[PDB]
Amino acid sequence: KQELIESISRKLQVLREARESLLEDVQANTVLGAEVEAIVKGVCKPSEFDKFRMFIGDLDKVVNLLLSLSGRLARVENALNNLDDGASPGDRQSLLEKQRVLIQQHEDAKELKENLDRRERIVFDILANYLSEESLADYEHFVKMKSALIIEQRELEDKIHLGEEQLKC
Amino acid sequence: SDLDHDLSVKKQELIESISRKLQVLREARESLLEDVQANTVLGAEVEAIVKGVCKPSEFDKFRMFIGDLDKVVNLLLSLSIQQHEDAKELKENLDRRERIVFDILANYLSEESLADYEHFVKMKSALIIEQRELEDKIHLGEEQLKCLLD
């Protein structure tokens, strides 16, 4: 048993360094977004700019909340997958109803995500008339890496917290 | 024990009054649902008009806005810090959207149809708000009775 504490205390640090590197990526993609923003503001009409900014913000928020709901839903579902083996009286129903509402909120968030995809294409369309193929490339890559980065970040954070709670017991 | 009796009296009276108030609130809720339905059919009317007159892209933007509205408001109320603040910015951006949609509809539509759009939205939010407020008052009064009756 005593070896697990050291092994996990090692992989945990591995994942921590991974969090640091991924954070550096967050900074890079951030300044990249600031430069894309600078260009759009510099070439696009004010309204179009407002639409662009709205899109990036709404993207951040939507992807965030969607990932949160996905997480909590996984926690509940897995809590039932592990609890059905065990025995507890009356507590399953509460997790069933909470599962229900979380499914509602999650499907809502997924609809918002879809709307934000079609929006994304609107923004790309209004940018395609002004920007270059290089600037459009930096834009597409900017958004894609934004979503991917925040996702992977929250996943890693889940794993490291899981390890912490694992050695605490 | 005279003041004890006085307490039983005043407490019972307040119980009856609270109960009546809860009846008023419930009636207000059920009557509100009717308004929700009416504004819903109105919404479908505006949707069909915009559908027939507008382009598929502009129409897609209109539908997107309408879909996002109820969701954003629902979140702001379900929360009302990171979560709630996100809801706040999404609300502001949602208002700016609203003005975009209104601007692309103002030229296509007529005067009365446009008034139907504006009203439809105003009530689309107002009704969710008022409904939340009602559930709040009802919850409060219920808990107060739970405390007084015991």
UniProtKB/Swiss-Prot annotation, chain B:
Abundant in retina and melanoma; also in brain, placenta, lung, kidney and pancreas. It is found in: Apical cell membrane; Cell junction, Tight junction; Cytoplasm, Cytoskeleton. Transmembrane segments: none annotated. The ASD1 domain mediates F-actin binding. Belongs to the shroom family. Interacts with F-actin. May be involved in endothelial cell morphology changes during cell spreading. In the retinal pigment epithelium, may regulate the biogenesis of melanosomes and promote their association with the apical cell surface by inducing gamma-tubulin redistribution. This is Protein Shroom2. It comes from Homo sapiens (Human). The gene is SHROOM2.
